[PDB]
Amino acid sequence: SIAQARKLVEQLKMEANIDRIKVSKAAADLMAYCEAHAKEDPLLTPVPASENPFREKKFFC
Amino acid sequence: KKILLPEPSIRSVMQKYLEDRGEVTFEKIFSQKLGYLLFRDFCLNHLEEARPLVEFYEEIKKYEKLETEEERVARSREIFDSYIMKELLAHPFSKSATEHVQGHLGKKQVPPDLFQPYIEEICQNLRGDVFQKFIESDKFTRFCQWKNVELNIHLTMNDFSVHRIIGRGGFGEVYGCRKADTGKMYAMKCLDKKRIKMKQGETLALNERIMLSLVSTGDCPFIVCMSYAFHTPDKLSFILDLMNGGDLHYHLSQHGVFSEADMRFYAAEIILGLEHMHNRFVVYRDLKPANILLDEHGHVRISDLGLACDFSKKKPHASVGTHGYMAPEVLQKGVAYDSSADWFSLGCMLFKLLRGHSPFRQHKTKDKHEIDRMTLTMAVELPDSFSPELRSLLEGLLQRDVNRRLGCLGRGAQEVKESPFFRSLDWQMVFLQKYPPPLIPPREEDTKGIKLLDSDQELYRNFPLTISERWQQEVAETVFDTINAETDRLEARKKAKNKQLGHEEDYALGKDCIMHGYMSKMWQRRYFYLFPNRLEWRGEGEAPQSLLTMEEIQSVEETQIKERKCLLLKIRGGKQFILQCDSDPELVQWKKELRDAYREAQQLVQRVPKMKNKPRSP
Amino acid sequence: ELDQLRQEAEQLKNQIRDARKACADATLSQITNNIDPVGRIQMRTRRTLRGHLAKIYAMHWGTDSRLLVSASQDGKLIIWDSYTTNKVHAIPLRSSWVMTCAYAPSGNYVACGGLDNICSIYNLKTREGNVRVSRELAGHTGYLSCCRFLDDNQIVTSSGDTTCALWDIETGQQTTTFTGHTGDVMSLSLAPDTRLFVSGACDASAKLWDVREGMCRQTFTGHESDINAICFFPNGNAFATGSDDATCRLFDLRADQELMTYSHDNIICGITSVSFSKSGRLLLAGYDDFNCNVWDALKADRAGVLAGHDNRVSCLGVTDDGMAVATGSWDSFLKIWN
């Protein structure tokens, strides 16, 4: 219908009315997040075996 | 040896089977002996609202059975005084209904109909909620236990304890035997399969089965009925009523001729018998005294139903019967006939009881064509000693013209009943077997050049049959009361044992389980639960730790393992899963509900992108 | 008049394309070209959770990184204690056709649903201890594909009816509805802040929704086939998609376009599930070839493989504390890897 088509134009104007930063800045910010928090991700910075539930940990709450 | 009811869980399967055939209705169950018995147990002992209704139903039923008018006038008022003043103060009766009832009563006229209006309104009140409360109740579970058995009846010689011979024939011999199941006394008619092929009696033997079948419903006292029919690899077999009194051609030999007063009695019982066959559209065609049998009290029944014939869909025209007792239209080349025939036979037979031979048999002749010629030509010369009212009856029956013969003019059996000859008899009393009988009885290798093919055997494929009301009546009047109590004890004990075991309630309740029950995998017996998307199973202890999904199932077929019918599920992985069942109803239903389950499941998944099988190989 | 608005419908589509091209000054793989590779990450399977009697369709970690819920073709939800293999609860459902599940952040409630077209909420600690249903949510006219809590009293469901919806669990009604997709919606993921969420559909597009305001801010096409799964990057300015076309894709919100495509030639089957590690460096993806592949998100290299299921990896999830990855499979087992 015309309702189904006018719904689209209204939306497509909505999507075009956002503003956009540059992919160079965009990527830069992701890589900043990874580098920053890389110390904490235990799949990259492993922890002691006794502190890891799934390896050698003994005491639990 | 004795009947072992299946467990209550059978309900899950059985109910679905019955519902599919619309057999879970008040009318369908209430009108069955065991259905009825379990129903009234429920209302009398377990639902205070239904009690007086059924009590009152059963009171009216006793009244229906009362012999004579003076007994009824008694019971009629006797009835209206007591229960009625509880029922009018309750569940009232209609004005409309009480109007007719009180109308007859005020005038002191008392038929059996008298209370029929009250019957109908009682049903109206029994078949609503009260029925649906019964379906929910443990007694419908018990009905389902009993019906399961009925529909699993496979008979063999092991089931019967055969005693003495009491009849030879062409294809085999009749015995006397006790069904070990219930201890009911019966007669077994064993036709030998090698004898049948030697005499070509293929339609002849398979005819009887269909004929016995049609006449065995109704609960009639004057025809030798069938309850079961079954066959072994080399023998056919009929379970029939037992009659220990010998046949009327044997007693005619020892007694000589009978009086009018004595012949009347037999004719009465034989007439009602014939009426029963005619109302069900069967012409007997071999009425002679040799085919009439006596029980130990003296009462009689028509027996040999081989030559009998259906006339509903088309009227026969052959020359079937014994030559002394065949109506003129049976003998004539291409003339068709119906119940007309059996009435002419009645004359011929009745005559022979009175004078010792067929009226068309003379000088003790043994020339079939001469005897057939008297039938068509000879006017039947009747004795002088005979009464007038007897002369009335016989020349009516032996009347050559079918349109001029008693029992053919429109009312059938009723024209003969109201003949002058039976003027003294209350015909109800005949049917009640209450008139005193006149006579009380005192206390092979020819077929070895013929082989049984598995083509011949297919002719008797649908031979076996069980007449429901007959089996139900057998059970009712023997083991039913006691076996109910016995399985009541088991079911109570298992529940008491499980209450000690900290009973885990049903695994089926709460979910979307389609149905459930025992089956055997591969033999390993296991309890199954069929769900919309899968079929689980467990062993006697724990919750199901095994299953088969609906999407795996390619086809559900039926196949043989050591001559027992089973289900052959073909799994997608090329594998096969075989299921056995404990009863035919169960086999029929699983097959169905699985075919319905996997087809429904496999389509639903097709829509779902998350559950369907996407491409993999290039 | 019908034509009149279908020209502006593609004039604006082209205004957007060129809008985005003006931002495409470099690529993520170029920017990241400088960083050290993560190197081979050889995660071993540390638990096997055995209980489900058939396929597993959907799994979800609890915030405590210890308990998880799984939903299965065998008609049950099970809540496991990963640390010990123990089952906390075997919940038998009222419909056999489940497809999804979800644990409360609180952990007091789980949710599930399927071809029933209802999102049922279960209360994991009644005033007795017996687990019971606390609410059904009827409203959708299509299968429930996915659902997630915001808090005890708010859930967000997606359906094959082609819509999403935000519920008020107490009243059991829909506060807001998210019409927009033109094909069955398949997965959703909440932004960490919750103010946003994204969805993914069989139309081959994902959409960023405005949870509270109730409308589509952005649409991200690029895939060639049904998008099966979706995941937000921990900082909420980018997300990742899994599809039948055999690729994952990283999309950045502020750049409003595709940044990255993960896809070796040898991988020809579909992605069923996707999740980032705590920092966001690794992108974990489940496949119909029975494997879960670990992708270097920033460099688009394959860092490693989680291989040990006999059938489709149907679902996966990283604990909030990044300690472990869970994979659920059509082989009926979950496995905890690290």
Ligand SMILES: O=C(N[C@@H]1CNCCC[C@H]1OC(=O)c1cc(O)c(C(=O)c2c(O)cccc2C(=O)O)c(O)c1)c1ccc(O)cc1
């Ligand atoms: O019918 C009975 N007895 C009859 C009485 N009539 C006179 C003949 C003797 C006897 O009949 C038989 O024993 C008998 C045996 C048979 O194998 C056959 C047949 O095989 C058969 C048939 O079934 C149908 C047509 C013809 C024949 C035949 O043998 O010619 C038969 O008709 C009677 C009888 C029935 C019940 C009961 O409890 C006790 C006895």
Ligand SMILES: [Mg+2]
């Ligand atoms: Mg004829």
